[PDB]
Symmetry: C3
Subunit: 327 residues, 3 copies
């Protein structure tokens, strides 16, 4: 009967349409390179006020070279003119009643204990230690540099898909409005401007600059390069996203934020050495460049072809059995 | 007829040969690991002359630890003995006629304006600012360290393909001529020497050391590990390429080169603080290690097998139809 | 005969079982993301004694920001109060007999030779050089900071599989015993504690802290994220491994270890500049985060399906031919 081939022909048409759209949707004919090779060069701009001092890029940005991970210092704690010697630790955890509890068995991983129980103040008695004196007092409250909200981060990103030798950059004057220096990045109004406002980045990550500057934190400027190298060279475009990386988990057991210690080493006219100990709180920025490209290839196209051919050939039989049975 | 099977047998032989060479060429029987895990340790060697001073590795290399990204400083601008205070900015962009145009609305992202219009010199009148005084003069011309062309970069690279747990290194004494310390890297005469001459790297990237040292730049020493783990362990070999990463695009809108600012912080005998502000131009080197290995696997070999089997089975039918029709 | 279909049915059952277990074992139905996107934040804790000085985290850890690569300085060589000038190099390789062998042709890549042959001591005569004087004496023996064995490394690692947008962290209070701060990492007793003991890390890598601290070295804290995103979110877990990265190859031709030079720059009350030159030996730690996830996908499941269908269909024929023939 002719209808039998009109039922099968319709069967093959329809079933082949489902399979066809599926394989075409997932780019099953494409080999994929997911090992992007990126270089990131950053430039921070701005000036702030801390105490009665003025901070410029040389004072609060560390490191200076413009790497993919850098820190904008917003708050710090200074302990000036330290010098090697003996002094009572100011940490309460080092409280003692007699020299019998200031032995090596106590706080093994901590500082160097001299073995004497001394009076830091009239209200506390702590183990004496050898090291930089006086000791640090990290329980005080200090101001935060608010101007850092208006600082700008300029990100130059140069990536390359090696499997295809397809290299491109994120400096695109055509995609962003002229006076490029004057652009700033908005996810909607200017999603291709390489200049990021610090406060903006803090907002895009859903973070309060006050609490963040107070406790410090780690933010990530994410550059994504999902590209179809079958389309125009013009179509491979970077997409920026933002996130806070220092988990604020309720379970915690650890204080949130981000801070680190460094000293400025001075030597005396008399030749003795003394440093300024600095506890720095700021916003570390990690530029994380992900990307994967897909290019047509003969091998994946043949495998997907055979897959769809055989799969349809079975689906038509199964559909014929389902029909003849009628249920 | 016997010829019918001699035509089909020849058909199957030939068609199967096309498919066979294609799948065998693309290593369709191989699973691929494109997530190389590399460690890079670098060592720079050399000494230069700048002004009437001698620069050693401790003076021009930053950072010192020998990471995958480092900078060889070739030119710098010094502003010595700065101290917090008030002074007229030297940038022309800060020109003013009266204190009415030195308000917060002007240059919001710039320095801290005091609000006074002062006379930097007799020919210019600029807004006064609070910060490190005197201000920087980044419009002067300074020499460049030419000896940096003869510096050598030693790159230790240790990579690992985790999917196969196949780890190897780029220090290969057998592939490079003895007196290894005396080797230097030429793409043809010594393509496995880990010692790179700075000037050589500048040449391999097609760059002029004069202009590059003058304006600074970003070069990439690329280590590629394309390997067939089906062949001998001896065959997985690294291949070095070179490129300049700071786009010099005509569209530009940004000054090419690479520079960053850092200060040397001194404290006075009287206790006041003062720094030396340094604008550094140099050549940043980014070691970019790409790699992908292919090892025989049962799953990809079966999928490719089925693919070629079915594909030939259809190609022979299509070729039979093309022949019987004769066109 | 009915037995013919009982032989074929058993044939299809058995053969289909081999193929089925194979494809199910290799997760052939899974698409794989091998481009993990990780952020690493490290914190070192401890204090040591070197000479009659006390070293804290600000003195021996470099860089300070807590990156994925950092160095714990264990031994160092100090050359104090250097100043630009002329002096005889102390390296024996610079031995001379007359000013005729101190020309530019000698040691082209080395220091700046003045051209004079001078007497460093009564037993050696070396070329004079311009640079930081006095010169460094890197042939002396210095102590090593032993307390560094008891230091602790705290590693915060935040990764993300972008293909699935599946992000997770390595701070897992449920997997590690409470008093999290008090945990320390043992591969068996506490394989999820983020706090690493320096000495432990040195042991897990099969290295002697004595020789390592003496010569310096490069260790890698490896975080592996092999995950089946088909299983519970709870099952994607990090696994830590350890390795020494500075090859100690017998062929060598290079001194093992790891060291770098940096200076502390001082300026004189009289205004002249002088530095302290420091050769630092320590243990560099490189946090290397690998990972690959597998999630069920329609495309790979269909391709593997067709593969097994066709492959079984041929295996049954081949097995029938092998049986009928009987050999
Ligand atoms: O100044 C301080 O007093 C200070 C206090 C702390 C603290 O939290 O107690 C810290 C700190 O963050 N850690 C890390 C830490 C904290 C809590 C829990 C931790 O373990 C887990 C958390 C969650 C999930 C799984 C495990 C890890 C310390 C704790 C112990 C060991 C140790 C070693 C090295 C470095 C730091 C720290 C740092 C400092 C400092 O700057 O010197
Ligand atoms: O010392 C200086 O005077 C100085 C000048 C410039 C400058 O080019 O104008 C710069 C500089 O490079 N940028 C970056 C920049 C420049 C031009 C165009 C830009 O945008 C695009 C370019 C091409 C394609 C798409 C976008 C981005 C500045 C410009 C604005 C904002 C801003 C913020 C942070 C950092 C730097 C800069 C730096 C400095 C400095 O060292 O302090
Ligand atoms: O203080 C020193 O005197 C000193 C000595 C050496 C040394 O080994 O001779 C070194 C050093 O490690 N290298 C690297 C090096 C050594 C041996 C063989 C090498 O080549 C291969 C090894 C194995 C396989 C394939 C190649 C590479 C030097 C050697 C030459 C060039 C050069 C350039 C830059 C930097 C360092 C070095 C450093 C210093 C220093 O800190 O200043
Ligand atoms: C580490 O600390 C323990 C005390 O917990 C001490 O017994 C041991 O000697 C220390 N290790 C070193 C190398 O000093
Ligand atoms: C250097 O002077 C300071 C105070 O000015 C003094 O405390 C110190 O002991 C002196 N140095 C030495 C080595 O005595
Ligand atoms: C940022 O600059 C604008 C002027 O453009 C100013 O109104 C605003 O107060 C500044 N932000 C902060 C936090 O000072
Ligand atoms: C320290 O001395 C300098 C000049 O020698 C002087 O300008 C400065 O005001 C002094 N410090 C203080 C706090 O006055
Ligand atoms: C590099 O060294 C050679 C001697 O080997 C010398 O002739 C040449 O001038 C040096 N290059 C520069 C730029 O000084
Ligand atoms: C500064 O003083 C030192 C010794 O105190 C002296 O050697 C040096 O020459 C002086 N500076 C200048 C520029 O003369
Ligand atoms: Mg403390
Ligand atoms: Mg300026
Ligand atoms: Mg030497
Ligand atoms: Na297939």
């Amino acid at each position: 009967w002719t209808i039998g081939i009109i039922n099968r022909v319709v069967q093959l048409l329809i079933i082949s349409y489902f399979v066809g759209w599926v394989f075409l949707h997932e780019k099953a004919y494409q080999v994929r390179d997911t090992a992007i090779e990126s270089s990131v060069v950053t430039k921070v701009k701005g000036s702030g006020l801390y105490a009665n001092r003025v901070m410029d890029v040389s004072d609060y940005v560390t490191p200076p070279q413009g790497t993919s991970v850098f820190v904008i210092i917003t708050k710090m704690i200074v302990t000036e003119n330290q010098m090697q010697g003996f002094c009572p630790e100011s940490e309460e955890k080092y409280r003692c009643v007699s020299d019998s509890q200031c032995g090596p068995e106590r706080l093994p991983g901590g500082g160097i204990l001299t073995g004497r129980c001394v009076n830091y103040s009239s209200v506390l008695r702590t183990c004496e230690i050898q090291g930089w004196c006086p000791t640090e007092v990290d329980t005080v409250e200090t101001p935060i540099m608010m101007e850092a909200e208006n600082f700008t981060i300029f990100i130059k990103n140069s990536i390359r898909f090696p499997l295809f030798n397809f290299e491109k950059g994120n400096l695109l004057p055509n995609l962003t409005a002229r006076d490029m220096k004057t652009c700033r990045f908005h996810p909607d109004k200017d999603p291709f401007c390489p200049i990021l406002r610090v406060g903006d980045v803090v907002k895009f990550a859903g973070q309060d600059f006050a609490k963040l500057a107070r406790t410090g934190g780690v933010l990530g400027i994410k550059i994504g390069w999902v590209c179809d190298l079958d389309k125009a060279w013009d179509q491979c475009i970077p997409k920026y996203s933002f996130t806070r990386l220092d988990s604020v988990s309720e379970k915690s057991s650890v204080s949130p934020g981000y801070n680190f210690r460094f000293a400025k080493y001075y030597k005396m006219e008399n030749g003795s050495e003394y440093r300024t100990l600095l506890k720095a709180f700021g916003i570390r920025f990690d530029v994380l460049v992900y990307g994967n490209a897909g290019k047509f290839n003969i091998i994946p196209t043949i495998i997907s072809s055979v897959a769809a051919f055989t799969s349809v050939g079975v689906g038509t039989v199964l559909c014929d059995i389902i029909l003849l049975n009628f249920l």
